[PDB]
Coordinates of C-alpha atoms and ligand atoms in Angstrom, one line a residue:
Chain Y
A1 CA 0.0 0.2 -0.3
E2 CA 1.4 3.1 -0.9
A3 CA 0.7 4.5 2.1
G4 CA 2.9 2.4 4.9
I5 CA 6.1 3.2 2.3
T6 CA 5.7 7.0 2.3
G7 CA 7.3 8.1 5.3
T8 CA 11.2 9.0 7.0
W9 CA 13.1 5.7 7.3
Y10 CA 16.1 5.3 9.0
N11 CA 18.9 2.4 9.1
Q12 CA 21.2 0.3 10.7
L13 CA 23.8 2.4 9.7
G14 CA 22.3 5.8 10.9
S15 CA 21.0 7.0 7.1
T16 CA 17.8 8.6 6.1
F17 CA 15.3 7.6 3.6
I18 CA 12.7 10.5 3.1
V19 CA 10.1 8.4 0.6
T20 CA 6.7 8.9 -1.3
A21 CA 5.1 5.6 -2.8
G22 CA 2.5 6.8 -5.2
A23 CA -0.4 4.7 -6.5
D24 CA 1.0 3.9 -9.7
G25 CA 3.8 2.0 -8.0
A26 CA 6.2 5.1 -7.8
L27 CA 8.7 5.8 -5.0
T28 CA 10.6 9.0 -5.3
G29 CA 12.4 10.9 -2.3
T30 CA 16.1 12.1 -1.2
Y31 CA 18.3 9.9 0.9
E32 CA 20.9 11.1 3.0
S33 CA 24.1 8.7 3.9
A34 CA 25.7 8.0 6.8
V35 CA 28.8 6.8 4.9
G36 CA 30.5 6.2 2.0
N37 CA 31.6 9.4 -0.2
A38 CA 28.1 11.4 0.3
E39 CA 27.0 15.0 1.4
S40 CA 24.0 15.8 1.8
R41 CA 20.6 15.0 -0.1
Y42 CA 20.2 12.6 -3.5
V43 CA 17.3 12.6 -5.4
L44 CA 15.9 8.6 -5.3
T45 CA 13.6 6.8 -8.0
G46 CA 12.3 3.2 -7.4
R47 CA 9.1 1.1 -7.9
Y48 CA 6.7 -1.0 -5.7
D49 CA 4.7 -3.8 -6.3
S50 CA 1.2 -3.0 -4.9
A51 CA 0.7 -6.4 -4.0
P52 CA -2.8 -8.0 -3.6
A53 CA -1.1 -10.1 -0.5
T54 CA -3.2 -11.9 1.6
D55 CA -0.7 -14.1 2.9
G56 CA 0.9 -11.5 5.6
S57 CA 3.7 -11.4 2.7
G58 CA 6.2 -8.5 2.8
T59 CA 6.1 -5.9 -0.6
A60 CA 8.9 -6.2 -3.1
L61 CA 10.5 -3.1 -3.9
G62 CA 13.5 -1.4 -4.7
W63 CA 15.1 2.2 -5.6
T64 CA 18.1 3.5 -7.0
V65 CA 20.5 6.5 -5.5
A66 CA 23.0 8.0 -8.2
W67 CA 25.6 9.7 -5.7
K68 CA 25.9 12.9 -7.4
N69 CA 24.0 16.3 -6.3
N70 CA 25.4 19.4 -7.1
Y71 CA 28.3 19.2 -4.0
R72 CA 29.5 15.9 -4.9
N73 CA 29.8 13.5 -7.5
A74 CA 30.7 9.6 -5.9
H75 CA 30.7 8.1 -9.8
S76 CA 28.3 5.2 -8.4
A77 CA 25.1 4.1 -7.9
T78 CA 23.4 1.6 -5.5
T79 CA 20.2 -0.3 -6.1
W80 CA 18.4 -1.5 -2.8
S81 CA 15.9 -4.9 -3.5
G82 CA 14.0 -5.9 -0.8
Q83 CA 10.2 -6.4 1.2
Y84 CA 8.8 -4.1 2.9
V85 CA 7.1 -5.2 6.3
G86 CA 4.1 -3.2 8.1
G87 CA 2.2 -3.3 11.0
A88 CA 3.5 -1.9 14.7
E89 CA 7.2 -2.0 14.0
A90 CA 7.4 -1.5 10.3
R91 CA 10.5 -2.8 8.5
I92 CA 11.8 -2.5 5.1
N93 CA 14.8 -5.4 4.6
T94 CA 16.9 -5.4 1.6
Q95 CA 20.4 -6.7 0.3
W96 CA 21.8 -3.9 -1.8
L97 CA 24.3 -3.7 -5.2
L98 CA 27.1 -0.9 -5.1
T99 CA 28.7 -0.5 -8.4
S100 CA 31.2 2.2 -8.9
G101 CA 32.6 3.3 -12.5
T102 CA 36.0 1.3 -13.6
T103 CA 37.9 0.9 -16.4
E104 CA 37.4 -2.7 -18.2
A105 CA 40.3 -4.1 -16.7
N106 CA 39.3 -3.0 -13.2
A107 CA 35.8 -4.4 -13.8
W108 CA 35.8 -7.4 -12.0
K109 CA 36.0 -4.9 -8.5
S110 CA 33.2 -2.7 -9.3
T111 CA 29.9 -4.1 -7.2
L112 CA 30.0 -4.3 -3.5
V113 CA 26.8 -6.5 -2.0
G114 CA 25.4 -5.8 1.6
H115 CA 22.2 -5.4 3.2
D116 CA 20.2 -2.8 4.7
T117 CA 17.2 -3.0 7.6
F118 CA 15.2 0.8 7.5
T119 CA 13.4 1.4 11.0
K120 CA 10.4 4.3 10.1
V121 CA 9.6 6.9 12.3
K122 CA 6.8 9.5 10.4
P123 CA 4.9 8.7 7.7
Chain O
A1 CA 29.3 7.9 -23.6
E2 CA 27.0 10.8 -23.7
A3 CA 23.6 10.7 -24.1
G4 CA 24.3 6.9 -25.8
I5 CA 22.7 5.2 -23.2
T6 CA 19.3 6.4 -24.9
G7 CA 18.1 3.5 -27.2
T8 CA 16.8 -0.5 -27.6
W9 CA 18.9 -3.1 -25.9
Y10 CA 18.7 -6.4 -25.7
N11 CA 20.6 -9.2 -23.4
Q12 CA 21.9 -12.6 -23.8
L13 CA 18.3 -14.0 -22.9
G14 CA 16.9 -11.9 -25.2
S15 CA 14.7 -9.2 -23.0
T16 CA 14.9 -5.9 -24.2
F17 CA 15.4 -2.4 -22.3
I18 CA 14.0 0.8 -24.0
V19 CA 15.5 4.2 -22.0
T20 CA 15.8 7.6 -22.4
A21 CA 18.4 9.5 -20.1
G22 CA 17.6 12.6 -19.2
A23 CA 19.9 15.7 -18.2
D24 CA 20.0 15.4 -14.5
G25 CA 20.8 11.7 -14.2
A26 CA 17.1 10.0 -14.5
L27 CA 16.8 7.2 -16.5
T28 CA 12.7 6.3 -17.8
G29 CA 11.5 3.5 -20.1
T30 CA 10.1 0.4 -20.5
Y31 CA 11.2 -3.8 -19.8
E32 CA 10.4 -6.8 -21.1
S33 CA 11.7 -10.0 -19.9
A34 CA 12.1 -13.1 -22.6
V35 CA 12.4 -15.6 -19.2
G36 CA 10.7 -15.4 -15.4
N37 CA 6.6 -14.9 -14.5
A38 CA 6.5 -12.2 -16.9
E39 CA 4.3 -10.7 -19.7
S40 CA 4.8 -7.6 -21.9
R41 CA 6.2 -4.2 -20.8
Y42 CA 7.3 -3.1 -17.7
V43 CA 7.5 0.6 -16.7
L44 CA 11.3 0.7 -15.2
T45 CA 12.9 3.9 -13.1
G46 CA 16.2 4.4 -12.4
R47 CA 19.4 6.9 -12.6
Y48 CA 23.0 7.3 -13.7
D49 CA 25.7 9.4 -12.8
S50 CA 26.7 12.0 -14.7
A51 CA 30.8 13.0 -14.3
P52 CA 33.8 13.4 -15.3
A53 CA 35.7 10.4 -16.5
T54 CA 39.6 11.0 -18.2
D55 CA 40.1 7.2 -17.1
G56 CA 37.6 5.9 -19.6
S57 CA 35.4 4.4 -16.8
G58 CA 31.7 3.3 -17.2
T59 CA 29.1 5.6 -16.4
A60 CA 27.7 3.9 -13.1
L61 CA 23.6 3.2 -13.4
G62 CA 20.4 1.4 -11.9
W63 CA 17.1 0.8 -12.0
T64 CA 14.0 -1.1 -11.2
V65 CA 11.6 -2.6 -12.2
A66 CA 8.8 -3.9 -10.3
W67 CA 6.5 -7.2 -12.2
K68 CA 3.4 -5.9 -11.9
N69 CA 1.9 -4.3 -15.0
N70 CA -1.9 -4.5 -16.4
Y71 CA -1.3 -8.6 -17.3
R72 CA 0.8 -10.2 -14.7
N73 CA 2.1 -9.1 -10.9
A74 CA 4.8 -11.3 -10.2
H75 CA 4.8 -9.8 -6.6
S76 CA 8.8 -9.3 -7.0
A77 CA 10.9 -6.5 -8.6
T78 CA 14.4 -6.7 -9.6
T79 CA 17.5 -4.0 -9.2
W80 CA 19.9 -3.7 -12.1
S81 CA 23.2 -2.2 -10.6
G82 CA 26.1 -1.8 -13.0
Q83 CA 27.8 0.5 -16.0
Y84 CA 27.5 1.2 -19.5
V85 CA 30.3 1.7 -21.7
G86 CA 30.4 2.9 -24.7
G87 CA 32.8 3.1 -28.0
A88 CA 32.3 1.1 -31.6
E89 CA 30.2 -2.0 -29.3
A90 CA 28.3 -0.1 -26.4
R91 CA 27.3 -2.4 -23.4
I92 CA 25.3 -2.4 -20.2
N93 CA 27.2 -4.6 -17.6
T94 CA 25.4 -5.6 -14.7
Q95 CA 24.9 -7.6 -11.9
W96 CA 20.7 -8.2 -10.1
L97 CA 19.2 -9.0 -7.2
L98 CA 15.4 -9.9 -7.7
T99 CA 13.1 -10.1 -4.7
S100 CA 10.0 -11.5 -4.3
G101 CA 7.3 -11.4 -1.2
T102 CA 7.9 -14.0 1.6
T103 CA 6.0 -14.5 4.7
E104 CA 8.6 -14.9 7.3
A105 CA 9.2 -18.1 7.0
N106 CA 11.0 -18.1 3.9
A107 CA 12.7 -15.2 4.2
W108 CA 15.9 -16.8 3.9
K109 CA 14.7 -17.6 0.5
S110 CA 13.9 -14.6 -1.5
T111 CA 16.6 -13.0 -3.6
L112 CA 18.0 -14.3 -6.3
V113 CA 21.4 -13.1 -8.0
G114 CA 22.6 -13.3 -11.4
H115 CA 23.9 -10.8 -14.2
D116 CA 22.7 -9.3 -17.5
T117 CA 25.1 -8.0 -20.1
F118 CA 22.9 -5.5 -22.7
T119 CA 24.1 -4.5 -26.4
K120 CA 22.3 -2.3 -29.1
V121 CA 22.9 -5.8 -31.3
Chain Z
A1 CA 43.6 -18.0 15.6
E2 CA 42.3 -21.2 14.9
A3 CA 41.2 -22.1 18.5
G4 CA 38.8 -19.2 18.5
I5 CA 36.7 -20.2 15.2
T6 CA 37.1 -24.0 16.9
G7 CA 34.0 -24.8 18.1
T8 CA 29.6 -25.0 18.2
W9 CA 28.3 -22.3 16.6
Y10 CA 24.5 -21.2 15.7
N11 CA 22.9 -19.2 13.4
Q12 CA 19.7 -16.7 13.8
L13 CA 18.2 -19.2 12.1
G14 CA 18.6 -22.4 14.4
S15 CA 21.3 -24.6 12.6
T16 CA 24.3 -25.8 14.0
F17 CA 28.2 -25.8 12.8
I18 CA 30.6 -28.3 14.3
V19 CA 34.0 -26.8 13.0
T20 CA 37.6 -27.5 13.5
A21 CA 40.3 -25.5 12.4
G22 CA 43.6 -26.6 11.4
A23 CA 46.9 -24.5 11.7
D24 CA 47.5 -24.4 7.9
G25 CA 43.9 -22.4 7.3
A26 CA 41.3 -25.3 6.6
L27 CA 38.6 -25.9 8.3
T28 CA 36.7 -29.1 8.7
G29 CA 33.2 -29.4 10.1
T30 CA 29.4 -31.0 9.8
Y31 CA 26.9 -28.5 9.3
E32 CA 23.1 -29.2 10.3
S33 CA 21.0 -26.4 9.1
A34 CA 17.3 -25.9 10.5
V35 CA 15.5 -24.8 7.1
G36 CA 15.5 -26.5 3.4
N37 CA 16.1 -30.1 1.9
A38 CA 18.7 -31.2 4.2
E39 CA 18.5 -33.4 7.3
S40 CA 20.8 -34.4 9.4
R41 CA 24.7 -33.9 9.8
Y42 CA 26.7 -32.9 6.1
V43 CA 30.6 -32.5 6.5
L44 CA 31.7 -29.1 5.4
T45 CA 35.3 -27.9 4.0
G46 CA 36.8 -24.3 3.9
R47 CA 39.7 -22.2 4.9
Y48 CA 40.2 -18.9 6.4
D49 CA 42.9 -16.8 6.8
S50 CA 45.2 -16.6 9.3
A51 CA 45.8 -13.1 9.3
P52 CA 48.2 -11.4 11.2
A53 CA 45.6 -8.6 12.0
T54 CA 46.7 -5.9 14.7
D55 CA 43.8 -3.6 13.9
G56 CA 40.7 -5.6 15.4
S57 CA 39.5 -6.6 12.0
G58 CA 37.5 -9.8 11.6
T59 CA 39.2 -12.7 9.6
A60 CA 38.0 -13.6 6.7
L61 CA 37.4 -17.2 5.8
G62 CA 34.3 -19.3 3.8
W63 CA 33.6 -22.7 3.7
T64 CA 31.3 -24.5 0.9
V65 CA 28.4 -27.6 2.6
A66 CA 27.7 -29.9 -0.9
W67 CA 24.1 -30.9 0.0
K68 CA 24.0 -34.6 -0.1
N69 CA 24.6 -36.8 2.5
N70 CA 23.4 -41.1 3.4
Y71 CA 20.3 -39.8 3.7
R72 CA 19.2 -36.4 1.5
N73 CA 20.5 -35.1 -1.7
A74 CA 19.2 -31.6 -2.6
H75 CA 21.6 -31.2 -5.5
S76 CA 22.6 -27.8 -4.2
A77 CA 26.0 -26.2 -2.9
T78 CA 25.8 -23.0 0.0
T79 CA 29.1 -21.1 -0.1
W80 CA 29.4 -18.8 3.1
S81 CA 31.9 -15.6 2.7
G82 CA 32.2 -13.8 5.8
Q83 CA 34.2 -12.7 8.5
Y84 CA 35.0 -13.6 12.3
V85 CA 35.4 -12.0 14.9
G86 CA 36.0 -12.6 18.5
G87 CA 36.0 -11.4 22.0
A88 CA 33.7 -12.4 24.6
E89 CA 30.8 -12.2 22.2
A90 CA 32.4 -13.9 19.0
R91 CA 30.2 -13.8 15.7
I92 CA 31.2 -15.1 12.3
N93 CA 29.3 -12.5 9.9
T94 CA 28.6 -13.8 6.8
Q95 CA 26.8 -13.8 3.1
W96 CA 26.1 -17.2 1.3
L97 CA 25.3 -18.0 -2.4
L98 CA 23.4 -21.3 -2.7
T99 CA 23.5 -22.8 -6.0
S100 CA 21.3 -25.7 -7.3
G101 CA 22.0 -27.6 -10.5
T102 CA 19.8 -26.8 -13.0
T103 CA 19.1 -26.8 -17.0
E104 CA 21.0 -24.6 -19.5
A105 CA 17.3 -22.8 -19.5
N106 CA 16.7 -22.1 -15.8
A107 CA 20.4 -20.9 -14.9
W108 CA 19.6 -18.0 -14.7
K109 CA 17.5 -18.9 -11.6
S110 CA 19.7 -21.1 -10.0
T111 CA 21.5 -18.9 -7.1
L112 CA 20.5 -17.4 -3.7
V113 CA 21.7 -14.5 -2.2
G114 CA 21.3 -14.1 1.7
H115 CA 23.2 -13.1 4.9
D116 CA 23.9 -15.5 8.4
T117 CA 25.5 -14.6 11.7
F118 CA 26.8 -17.3 14.1
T119 CA 26.8 -17.0 17.8
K120 CA 29.2 -19.3 19.4
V121 CA 28.4 -21.6 22.5
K122 CA 31.3 -24.2 22.9
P123 CA 34.9 -24.9 21.6
Chain B
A1 CA 29.9 -35.1 -16.2
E2 CA 31.3 -38.3 -14.2
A3 CA 35.4 -37.4 -13.6
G4 CA 34.9 -34.4 -15.9
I5 CA 35.4 -31.9 -12.6
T6 CA 38.9 -33.0 -12.0
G7 CA 41.8 -31.4 -14.6
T8 CA 42.7 -28.1 -15.3
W9 CA 40.4 -25.0 -15.8
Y10 CA 40.7 -21.2 -16.7
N11 CA 38.5 -18.0 -16.6
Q12 CA 37.5 -15.3 -18.4
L13 CA 40.4 -12.8 -16.7
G14 CA 43.4 -15.6 -17.2
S15 CA 43.5 -17.5 -13.8
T16 CA 43.9 -21.5 -13.9
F17 CA 41.9 -23.3 -11.1
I18 CA 43.8 -27.5 -11.3
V19 CA 41.2 -29.9 -9.1
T20 CA 40.8 -33.2 -8.3
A21 CA 37.5 -34.5 -7.3
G22 CA 37.1 -37.6 -4.6
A23 CA 34.1 -40.1 -4.9
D24 CA 32.6 -38.8 -2.1
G25 CA 31.9 -35.1 -3.1
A26 CA 35.0 -33.9 -2.0
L27 CA 37.2 -31.2 -4.2
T28 CA 40.1 -30.6 -3.6
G29 CA 43.5 -28.3 -5.7
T30 CA 45.0 -25.6 -5.9
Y31 CA 44.2 -21.5 -7.7
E32 CA 46.0 -19.4 -8.9
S33 CA 44.8 -15.5 -10.2
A34 CA 45.5 -13.6 -13.3
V35 CA 43.9 -10.3 -11.1
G36 CA 43.9 -8.8 -7.6
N37 CA 46.3 -9.0 -4.7
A38 CA 47.6 -12.6 -5.1
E39 CA 50.9 -14.2 -6.0
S40 CA 51.3 -18.2 -7.1
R41 CA 49.4 -20.9 -6.0
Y42 CA 47.0 -21.1 -3.1
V43 CA 45.3 -24.3 -1.3
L44 CA 41.5 -24.5 -2.5
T45 CA 39.0 -27.1 -0.7
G46 CA 35.2 -27.7 -1.8
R47 CA 32.9 -29.8 -1.8
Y48 CA 30.4 -30.9 -5.3
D49 CA 27.2 -32.6 -5.2
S50 CA 27.1 -36.4 -7.4
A51 CA 23.6 -36.4 -8.2
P52 CA 20.9 -38.1 -10.1
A53 CA 20.5 -36.2 -13.8
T54 CA 17.6 -37.4 -15.7
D55 CA 17.0 -33.9 -16.8
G56 CA 21.0 -32.6 -17.5
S57 CA 21.1 -30.1 -14.6
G58 CA 24.7 -29.3 -13.8
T59 CA 26.6 -30.4 -10.9
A60 CA 26.4 -28.2 -8.1
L61 CA 29.7 -27.8 -6.0
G62 CA 31.5 -24.3 -4.4
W63 CA 35.0 -24.1 -3.0
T64 CA 37.0 -21.4 -0.7
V65 CA 40.2 -20.2 -1.4
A66 CA 41.6 -18.0 1.8
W67 CA 44.1 -15.2 -0.3
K68 CA 47.5 -16.4 2.1
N69 CA 50.2 -17.8 1.1
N70 CA 53.5 -18.5 1.6
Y71 CA 54.1 -15.1 -0.7
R72 CA 50.6 -13.3 0.6
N73 CA 48.3 -12.6 2.7
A74 CA 46.0 -9.9 1.2
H75 CA 43.3 -10.7 4.2
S76 CA 40.8 -12.1 2.4
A77 CA 38.7 -15.2 1.3
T78 CA 36.8 -16.2 -1.6
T79 CA 34.3 -18.6 -2.4
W80 CA 32.7 -19.9 -5.7
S81 CA 29.4 -21.0 -5.9
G82 CA 28.1 -22.5 -9.3
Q83 CA 27.6 -25.6 -11.6
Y84 CA 29.6 -27.4 -13.9
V85 CA 28.3 -28.7 -16.8
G86 CA 29.6 -31.2 -19.0
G87 CA 29.1 -32.2 -22.8
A88 CA 31.7 -31.2 -25.9
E89 CA 32.9 -28.2 -24.2
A90 CA 32.7 -28.1 -20.3
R91 CA 32.1 -25.2 -18.0
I92 CA 32.0 -24.2 -14.5
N93 CA 29.5 -21.0 -14.3
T94 CA 30.3 -19.4 -10.9
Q95 CA 29.0 -16.3 -8.8
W96 CA 31.6 -15.4 -6.0
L97 CA 31.7 -13.5 -3.4
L98 CA 35.5 -11.9 -1.8
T99 CA 35.1 -10.6 1.7
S100 CA 38.2 -8.8 3.2
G101 CA 38.6 -8.6 6.9
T102 CA 37.3 -5.3 7.9
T103 CA 37.6 -2.8 11.5
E104 CA 33.5 -2.7 11.9
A105 CA 33.4 0.9 10.6
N106 CA 34.3 -0.7 7.3
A107 CA 32.2 -3.7 7.4
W108 CA 29.4 -2.5 5.3
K109 CA 31.9 -2.4 2.2
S110 CA 33.8 -5.8 3.3
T111 CA 32.0 -7.9 0.1
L112 CA 33.1 -7.7 -3.3
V113 CA 30.2 -10.4 -5.6
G114 CA 31.0 -11.2 -9.7
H115 CA 30.9 -14.0 -11.6
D116 CA 33.2 -15.9 -13.5
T117 CA 33.2 -19.2 -16.1
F118 CA 35.6 -21.9 -16.4
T119 CA 36.3 -24.2 -19.2
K120 CA 39.6 -26.0 -20.0
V121 CA 40.6 -24.2 -23.1
Ligands
IMI201 N1 22.8 3.3 4.1 C1 23.7 3.2 3.3 N2 25.0 3.5 3.2 C2 25.6 2.6 2.2 C3 25.3 1.3 1.7 C4 24.5 1.3 0.7 S1 25.3 2.7 -0.4 C5 26.1 3.0 0.9 C6 26.6 4.6 0.9 C7 27.7 4.9 -0.4 C8 27.5 6.4 -0.1 C9 28.5 6.7 -1.7 C10 29.7 5.8 -2.1 O1 30.3 5.9 -1.2 O2 30.0 6.1 -3.1 N3 23.4 1.9 2.4
IMI202 N1 15.8 -9.7 -18.9 C1 15.9 -10.5 -17.5 N2 14.9 -11.8 -17.0 C2 15.7 -12.4 -15.9 C3 16.8 -11.5 -15.2 C4 16.7 -10.3 -14.3 S1 14.8 -10.5 -13.6 C5 14.3 -11.8 -14.8 C6 13.5 -11.9 -14.8 C7 11.8 -12.0 -13.9 C8 10.6 -12.2 -14.5 C9 9.5 -12.1 -13.0 C10 9.8 -13.1 -11.9 O1 9.5 -14.3 -12.4 O2 9.9 -13.0 -11.0 N3 17.0 -10.4 -16.6
IMI203 N1 21.7 -21.8 7.8 C1 21.4 -21.8 6.5 N2 20.4 -22.9 6.1 C2 20.1 -21.9 4.9 C3 20.9 -20.8 4.4 C4 21.7 -20.8 3.8 S1 22.3 -23.0 3.2 C5 20.5 -22.9 3.7 C6 19.6 -24.3 3.9 C7 19.9 -24.7 2.7 C8 19.6 -26.5 3.1 C9 19.7 -27.3 1.6 C10 18.9 -26.5 0.4 O1 17.8 -26.2 0.8 O2 19.0 -26.7 -0.5 N3 21.8 -21.1 6.5
IMI204 N1 40.1 -15.5 -10.9 C1 39.3 -14.7 -10.5 N2 40.2 -13.4 -9.4 C2 39.3 -12.2 -9.2 C3 37.5 -13.0 -9.3 C4 37.5 -14.1 -7.8 S1 38.4 -13.9 -6.4 C5 39.5 -12.7 -7.9 C6 41.0 -12.6 -7.1 C7 40.9 -11.6 -5.9 C8 42.7 -12.0 -5.5 C9 43.4 -11.6 -4.1 C10 42.5 -9.6 -3.5 O1 43.1 -9.2 -4.1 O2 41.4 -10.4 -2.4 N3 38.2 -14.1 -10.2

């Protein structure tokens, strides 16, 4: 449901995600990362699957953040693929891939993989 | 390099990606998969990092497709993270994560990881 | 150090890992998984990097479990790549890839990715 | 299929893997990488699942290499998870995770993911 996702979220690393989920399955917002070559907010764009889900199943969603804004250019993009679980303590569990632009030779070391969990605070 | 991301791309599996790259890093288009629980085109939205690149680096980009359209709703989303390379033979090399919405019991086995290489050929 | 790794470990899913770390960097043991197509123990084999690590850095290690024993054959193999952190509450943080043997056509859906954290109980 | 895993393999990067497959699922050998902070051969140990396969499935296998030998100690370990396919042109298709030992601060960026395809060519 767009509503429950829409809000301010923070993860275990201390980063901020402000997102608005549109009725058509769209997600737009700003991301603030507590770590890496990142300063201030960055635009985020993604999609979520408005599931009929009568199973107590999480909603599958994903978003990209290219790390370039008017103050910094990290030359990298992170995609998060995860599941949103609501209820009283709503969480978004994810796994992410962070690709940095590289030369052909160094492409084998371009992607980092990891996992983040977001806890919601405000709508 | 430059506007070269915009176009129609195909991966090893036969899927098609039609993207438009906006001047401030936005990516919009449609995706049609050749494999999996999917049918027709799907809306995709992403971002690419416009940058200086004296060393011939690729352009970092990424996009998401929630597999729900007017025909199917696979209850999943794939994100592709990768980089575009130009030249006579442009290509987008990516690694993707596909997450399906599971119940708590099955969360351990919710995410598939893989890799696709797209060319305009 | 071989010693601290050697012992009984359990993860958030409730699986057992009994391992003995050899001085040469070898790891052998039995794994008992609380989930998936698995029954009773399975042989595990891996390696760990006997780091001089004066930084409070984790020890990098990895191991494979092919899921075939005398009672079941799951036709799959899981590799865990992680870091061992000791101290009073020693943990092994990992990320894993689970590949199932597939036909050529279905190879794009052969690998699962996830992450497990093990808490130690006994040497 | 059968003992065909045993041999000398090479991946796209030019690395070499020499493995021996034991009858009860063990894998032993050496690995020499062509890229990264590595020098010479390294001990590898793994497992492969010996099975029935009426549908022409690959053989699931996996192995670990801790990048420490008498020459270097990169303080990391790579695990390859994948499957072997036989036929006139045998290949081992894998996805790998490389974890480096970080301090707590850097744990988020400790693991590289990638993919290699090995052939006896
Ligand atoms: N909140 C998070 N921060 C790190 C992880 C994945 S994205 C990452 C920060 C990256 C900042 C930009 C960069 O260093 O390239 N999640
Ligand atoms: N073009 C590609 N198709 C598969 C991979 C990445 S996503 C995938 C298709 C998944 C379809 C929907 C599903 O079955 O969940 N590349
Ligand atoms: N302790 C764990 N159990 C699951 C994860 C990764 S391995 C997995 C169990 C797999 C059992 C065999 C199978 O289902 O193929 N960790
Ligand atoms: N043959 C391959 N070499 C690279 C990939 C997987 S592991 C890697 C080399 C890493 C060397 C040690 C290091 O730099 O950490 N495939």
